[PDB]
Amino acid sequence: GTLRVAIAKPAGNLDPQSHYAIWAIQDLMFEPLVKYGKGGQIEPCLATDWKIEDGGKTLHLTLREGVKFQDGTKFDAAACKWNLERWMGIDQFSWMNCSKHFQSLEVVDDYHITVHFKEPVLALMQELSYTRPTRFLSPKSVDADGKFKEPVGTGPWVQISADDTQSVFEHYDGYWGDKPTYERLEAKVIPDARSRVAALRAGEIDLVGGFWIAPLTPEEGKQLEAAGFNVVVDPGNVTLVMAFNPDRAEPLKDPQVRKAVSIGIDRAAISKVLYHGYAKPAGNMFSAALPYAGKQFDAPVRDAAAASALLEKAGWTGSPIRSKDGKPLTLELVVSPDAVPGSRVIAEVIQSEMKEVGIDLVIRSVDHAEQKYDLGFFLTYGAPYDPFGSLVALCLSTFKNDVEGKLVTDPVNLDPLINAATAATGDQIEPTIQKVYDWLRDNDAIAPLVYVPSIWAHSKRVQGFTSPVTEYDMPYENIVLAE
Template sequence: MTASRRTFLKGLAVAPALFGGLSSTISAYAQKAKAHGDLIVAIAKPAGNLDPHKYIGLWAVQDLMFEPLMRYGKNGQIEPALATEWAVEDNGKLLRVKLRQNVTFQDGTSWDAEAMMWNLDRWIGKPANNWMNSSRLYSGHRIVDPHTVELQFKEPVLGLLYEFSYVRPSRFLSPKSVDKDGNYQAPVGTGPWIQESASNSESTFKRFDGYWGDLPTFEHVELKVLPDSRSRMAALRAGEIDLAGGDYLAPIKATEAKALESAGIPVTVETGTTTIVLAYNPDRNEALKDVRVRKAINIGFDRAAIGQVLYQSLAEPAGSLFPANVPHAGKRFDVAKRDVEAAKALLEVAGWSGSGIREKDGKKLSLELVVSEEQMAGSRSLGEILQSQLGEIGIELTIRSVDHASRHSDIPARKYDMALFYTLGAPYEPFGTLVGLFLSTFNNGVDGKLFLDPANLDPLVLAATSASEADVAGATQAIYDWLYNEVAISPLFYAPIIWAHAPRVQGFTPPSTEYDLPYKNITLGA
């Protein structure tokens, strides 16, 4: 079934009515929760294996326990964390860090140079992590004293400080939290929260009162697994949770955000650093090998109208791969405007003709779009609008909805004609996406690839990763120009960061990245 713009607007008109009668239940819950000193946060799936050197668990949950050398702050500012000072020397090939003193892991183990290098030895310089420049170019280290370490690299490392702010694999685990063979056993870090329990329904954490920094004002964090968006909204309405949001934690749709606002639930929206992208797989569908077909698709739908209807104008239509707030985002490309006649003309020239669904050599112009509500809230609705609008230019679009597990198997196996992706966002940009989602020789696990062209695209990506600081802007721009000219991808929207919280949550500020859990500065009122 297809869906029109009118259908979506009609659906939105009744949404605020769903949120009536909140104040008494929220008030009763707030009084009870305050007595227990708990912050209750929704998560869309279980936290999983929290080993910070593996790519498995929920990033934001790892952030509760594991800290980096430097932290990525607002607008990309690098802030001290487990390192208090640093210097990049030897023309960018040496990093000297001064470690914070009087810090212990949650099991009492000292944080010092030996603990730092024990952690780095678990991941740096290993092929699996060579998507990071610091790992690929690492050549050795020197412990100067118990709280000073020098890291040496073969070449200058672009984005070096950003890489040491990543949630994984750059954060620090207690050396005592592994068995005699070095196998991870428990999530023990230096952060302000200690894991108490973990199950498929919830995880609980207590405050680490030996934490070196500012202590949270509340004693516990409870993470409630609520896989369905509707269940999260119901829990917010009923006062059963305090906080939900973030694209990777417990996503809130723009339509839900507007309805929550109308009901008096505090909602915070900021422009994020991730982009929603429509990916093409020409290796699976012959029609997509023709750039004219990709161009027709790119101008065959209306980003502005979709943004107003589906995202309530909270998401900015995208012309470039990255929003301007991402380092080395490149020049701004114009947002493609819908042009039905031009799209039809491109398909005619490409040999796809006929009324209704176009055909070529007796074959219909039929494409499959894979979406996952668990991976991207609202993706099914977005797919239905694309289905309707592309149908008007003669393209038959079928939609296959998959759960999170199926997406993580189908996307890397390239079992799709088209699919919806997120770029990785801060602090991983631009090289996290450029290498992870485009370089054919890099195995990025379950994330899959936005586009593959080993002959033409790989050399551009490799040139950018090895460019000097003076040349990196031109090298990354060469990638963006190629992607734009080939219509290798279709950037759709710069995803907004949306959070909603109970009225009793005071001092909430959105996190600097989608990989952090925003517990800082929060106080729990009556």
């Protein structure tokens, strides 16, 4: 009656307002106001309803009645304020828009709270779905000093024990929502990916996978598949995107050349070599799994003939390599195997495919070690930060962060469309954001390659396995154990 799940390292300290735990573990007993559902659909959790007013500066919340914390204390407006007051407006959470713009917090009754903000809050509800710091810890569980002691949330699982070999949880009785069909969940610390594979084959664990839980590469997936195991691939929510730098590479200023580069590539071959066929070719910057991902298009199918024709219309002629005004069509793809595993390999598939359309792709393979590149690779941020996290961070000129880099920067043309989308409310977010995506697509400003898949495996006895919506969730839901 016990589900066992690998984790790649100890759970850590579970303080729901700090940064030391494995998120998926916190997700076991901590609950948010609203949940990030499939497709980025916002669902009722500790709040049953909500209303956003004042152009996004006011949030009204109706709290769920009949909720108890695992220590038996009551969930209500007072307990909600006390938590929210623990993290919102604290300088340490300024990276989140709702903390940063937080103005004030009025309790109205035992089940109604209103929050006020100095400015509209981009993706407000989404942010409130996060694993941390947005979740609810019993006010009586913490001492005079206010320091986190025990992990007393409202969620379905109670921590029975934790150390550096496993952590052990039991179903919480008088949990408000649906209870697990099984009695217990153990999280076993197995750091080496070779061991994790073995442990599933033996019947030592039931579950393996998750970027931030117990990763399982493509190769491991095929292996397990070969061993007759259930291998479950989520097409994912992070996009590998190739970027163009026309400021450096005079040929990429011609959008016909960009397009040719993009349809001259075989995403399917990218998926084969790097992800063993498991990755879905990308037509859109964001997969359909994300909210506001746009009108969805088919991933382009490699078309060398169409690519060659574009290049010729643009005045690049020659064989085997095209030139123009005596200059060969040479582009430098900069890669770091450190920062994107498989990065070099991708480059050699592409270089070979570019060769076929007449482009001479030079690869510069680097350390984790700045616009000195013609082409390069970016990865989107993924759920639950997207699409606005990536759009803003990677595409808005005016947003400038040391750690980032830019996919595409057009102040006169794109910024306005991004700004309008970030300003949009309710019904108007979708068509406003659709204009960002039309711009990018009509101008061939970026080249999405594949969606990065997320791979889980379970044992034969696990039924009801449901791929997690984000990498910060533990997929314990729905499971029934046959034995």
